[PDB]
């Protein structure tokens, strides 16, 4: 009956037990700030925001850390294309991303560590990796050696043999020596930049300790990004680093993966010009977070229509509460409605406890809404207690899913 989560590390559903009672330390991989956020970022971060909201709803104190990679080769390439500075562009798109997450009613992360503010910690981490023998120096930087970590391939399941101044093809850069014209920082191994995988591990170990509960990200990050993270962390610490791994499914456009490389990406700013943020949240939440999400305009229209139906139900409840009277007795209709509301709340909690299955939770919500509409149609004089219980259930739904916020604000 407890909350179970799907662990990608074991590829199975396990009962959720945090390391420290009453606290969930969750880390999610933030976006790379070089262009406007698209629907994949919205899907991933809305799913993890709903996970955070539900964990807080169950009584946990959630410390959520989302990194802000503000230096990368893609960022430098974009700055060179636009003739800007790789830092001004990063700051501008960090602000754009924060505004977009604020618009989508996503709760801001508790800490937003930046790479440029944690260079020394990364350098110390790479030095500690080198003194343990897990790193070597190449002609163009410091590289991590995969074969010295026997448990490589634990998360994704990719074998080393399949992967086969870098010694081995499967090795990866921990510190890259600087090219002329690009940003760089002083280091004992030469002036350069950090790698694309050391940053998240360094920030997570700095702000959450050597071990925390939940590491999150996109499904593409399973390999090589998160495998690199777990390899580096267990090489540096020698013990388990992340207890539960959560990955959101891909967003699909006409049967292919949504990404900026193929150019089939729709920005959040573009969607906001056509749909309300709660409509986008409902469209994201209509599918399980591990399942692929097919992006169609008809799907968004259907989500809009369903959200409008729920809005109409809430407005009808509000209107009926103006003339609702106290119940000195309950008929068969009142007991039927109460039973449906109670069963809907139980099914909502059961669905959210089953790997955050928001689809069944929405099914329960719609069952409760249909029952309330039937009760308001059939009851000659609506009872105040029934409407109050319905509003309590919808308030729980609002707190968990982040919808109906304007209705319950008033």
Does the annotation flag 347 for ligand binding? no
The answer to whether residues 104 and 42 touch, using CB atoms and an 8 Å cutoff, is yes
Closest distance between Zn ion and the C-beta of residue 379, in Å?
30
What, of a second copy, Zn ion, none, does residue 345 touch, CB below 5 to 8 Å by kind?
a second copy
Q: How far is the C-alpha of 286 from the C-alpha of 401, rounded, in Å?
A: 11
What, of a second copy, Zn ion, none, does residue 331 touch, CB below 5 to 8 Å by kind?
none
Q: How far is the C-alpha of 163 from the C-alpha of 24, rounded, in Å?
A: 35
Q: How far is the C-alpha of 163 from the C-alpha of 123, rounded, in Å?
A: 28
Closest to a second copy by CB, 124 or 392: 392
The answer to whether residues 381 and 325 touch, using CB atoms and an 8 Å cutoff, is yes
Q: How far is the C-alpha of 238 from the C-alpha of 316, rounded, in Å?
A: 59
Closest distance between a second copy and the C-beta of residue 294, in Å?
33
Rg (CA), the chain: 24
Q: How far is the C-alpha of 104 from the C-alpha of 93, rounded, in Å?
A: 16
Tell me how many residues contact Zn ion (CB under 5 A): 3
Q: Among 151, 240, 392, 406, indicate the residue that binds a second copy (CB under 8 A).
A: 392
Q: Among 31, 37, 113, 277, indicate the residue that binds a second copy (CB under 8 A).
A: 113
Kindly state whether residue 108 participates in binding a second copy, applying the rule CB under 8 A.
yes
CB atoms within 10 A of CB 217: 21
Q: How far is the C-alpha of 114 from the C-alpha of 68, rounded, in Å?
A: 5
Letters for 330-369 (x = contact with a second copy by CB under 8 A, - = none) are: x-------x--xx--xx--x--------------------
Kindly state whether residue 323 participates in binding a second copy, applying the rule CB under 8 A.
no
The sign of the torsion formed by the CA atoms of 388, 310, 352, 345 equals positive
Q: Among 259, 264, 327, 373, indicate the residue that binds a second copy (CB under 8 A).
A: 327
Nearest to 47 by CA among 269, 216, 234: 216
Q: How far is the C-alpha of 362 from the C-alpha of 369, rounded, in Å?
A: 10
Q: How far is the C-alpha of 33 from the C-alpha of 94, rounded, in Å?
A: 6
Q: Among 26, 29, 174, 284, indicate the residue that binds Zn ion (CB under 5 A).
A: 29
Nearest to 258 by CA among 271, 246, 245: 271
Query: 140, exposed or middle or buried, with CB in 10 Å at 0-12, 13-18, 19+?
Result: middle
Q: Among 61, 296, 308, 312, indicate the residue that binds a second copy (CB under 8 A).
A: 61
Does the annotation flag 236 for ligand binding? no
Closest to Zn ion by CB, 4 or 225: 225
Q: Among 55, 89, 106, 200, indicate the residue that binds Zn ion (CB under 5 A).
A: 200
Closest distance between a second copy and the C-beta of residue 212, in Å?
14
Known binding residues are 29, 200, 225, 229, 260
User: Which residues contact Zn ion (rule: CB under 5 A)?
Assistant: 29, 200, 225
User: Which residues contact a second copy (rule: CB under 8 A)?
Assistant: 1, 21-23, 56, 59, 61, 63, 68, 98, 107-114, 117, 207, 326-330, 338, 341-342, 345-346, 349, 384-385, 388-389, 392
Known binding residues for ATP are 260
Known binding residues for Zn(2+) are 29, 200, 225, 229
């Amino acid at each position: 009956g407890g909350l179970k989560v799907y662990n990608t590390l074991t590829k199975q559903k396990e009962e959720f037990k945090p390391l420290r009672e009453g606290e969930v330390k969750m880390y999610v991989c933030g976006p790379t700030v070089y262009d406007y956020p698209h629907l994949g970022h919205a899907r991933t971060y809305i799913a993890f925001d709903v996970i955070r909201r539900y964990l807080e709803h169950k009584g946990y104190t959630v410390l959520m850390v989302m990194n802000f990679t503000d230096i990368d080769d893609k960022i430098i390439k974009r700055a060179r294309e636009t003739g800007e500075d790789p830092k001004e562009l990063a700051e501008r798109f960090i602000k754009i991303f924060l505004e977009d997450m604020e618009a989508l009613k996503v709760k801001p992360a508790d800490i937003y560590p930046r790479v440029t503010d944690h260079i020394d910690d990364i350098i110390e981490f790479i030095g500690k990796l080198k003194e343990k023998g897990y790193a070597y120096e190449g002609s163009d930087g410091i590289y991590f050696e995969v074969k010295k970590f026997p448990e490589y391939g634990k998360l994704s399941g990719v074998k080393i043999e399949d992967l086969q101044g870098k010694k081995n093809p499967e090795d990866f850069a921990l510190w890259k020596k600087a090219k002329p014209g690009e940003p760089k920082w002083d280091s004992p191994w030469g002036e350069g930049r950090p790698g694309w995988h050391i940053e998240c591990s360094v920030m997570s170990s700095k702000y959450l300790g050597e071990s925390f509960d939940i590491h999150g990200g996109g499904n593409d990050l399973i390999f090589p990004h998160h495998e690199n993270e777990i390899a580096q962390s267990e090489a540096c610490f020698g013990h388990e680093w992340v207890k539960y791994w959560l990955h959101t499914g891909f967003v699909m456009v006409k049967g292919e993966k949504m990404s900026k490389s193929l150019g089939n990406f729709v920005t959040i700013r573009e969607l906001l010009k056509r749909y309300e943020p709660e409509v986008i949240r409902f469209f994201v939440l209509q599918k399980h977070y591990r399942s692929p999400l097919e992006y169609t305009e008809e799907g968004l229209q259907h989500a809009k229509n369903n959200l409008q139906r729920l809005y109409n139900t809430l407005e009808n409840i509000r209107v009926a509460l103006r003339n609702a009277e106290i119940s000195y007795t309950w008929g068969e209709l009142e007991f039927k409605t109460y039973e449906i509301i109670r069963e809907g709340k139980r099914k909502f909690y059961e669905a959210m406890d089953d790997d955050f299955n928001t689809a069944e939770a929405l099914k329960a919500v719609f069952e409760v809404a249909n029952a309330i509409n039937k009760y308001l149609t059939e009851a000659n004089k609506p009872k105040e207690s029934i409407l109050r219980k319905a509003l309590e259930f919808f308030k729980i739904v609002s707190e968990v899913f982040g919808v109906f916020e304007d209705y319950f604000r008033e």
